[PDB]
Assembly symmetry: C2
């Protein structure tokens, strides 16, 4: 069965282009426009702008992992994501970067 | 404590980071070349090695990034402050 990746983003073009770079037998990608998890989600990739300020990805996690996409560098923003348990990428984020980051993340986890 | 090795010439970064990590939980040391966690400058990372590591980048290059991720390496791009590094370290090790 393929790993299921939910992208929470309004960047539809990023979604489609990243999806066609991931092998469907290994990864199934779906997109939403508001932060959530799904029962089948192995990984949620969420725009910082759609990620609620108050949520955490806790140490003894039983839900999905979440990787966060940031438009910008800001020190306390970064410190804050890291202490809340989210790793992230800062833009520029190309379909190629996102594909390899998704594969890397799910292979290490 | 977890052993964290920093491979970097950024001595200010080393000391200020180490100072933020509680020495009971983390033991940080420095290395001039390439541990529970290695943080390696891109400029001192081998280049044909794959990951068994967090790589510090001076700047953004799409091809470098793609390459590191496929080789198995996560990265931070500068600016990289001691508070950022201390938190990245704690995150990776938890």
């Amino acid at each position: 069965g393929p790993k299921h990746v939910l992208l929470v983003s309004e960047h539809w073009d990023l979604f489609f282009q990243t999806k066609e770079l991931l092998n469907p037998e290994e990864y199934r990608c779906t997109i939403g426009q508001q932060y959530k998890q799904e029962l089948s989600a192995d990984l949620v990739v969420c725009e910082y702008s759609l990620l609620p300020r108050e949520i955490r990805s806790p140490k003894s996690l039983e839900g999905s992992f979440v990787l966060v996409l940031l438009d910008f560098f800001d020190e306390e923003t970064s410190v804050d994501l890291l202490d809340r348990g989210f790793w992230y990428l800062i833009r520029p984020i190309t379909p190629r970067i996102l594909k390899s980051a998704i594969s890397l993340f799910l292979s290490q986890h």
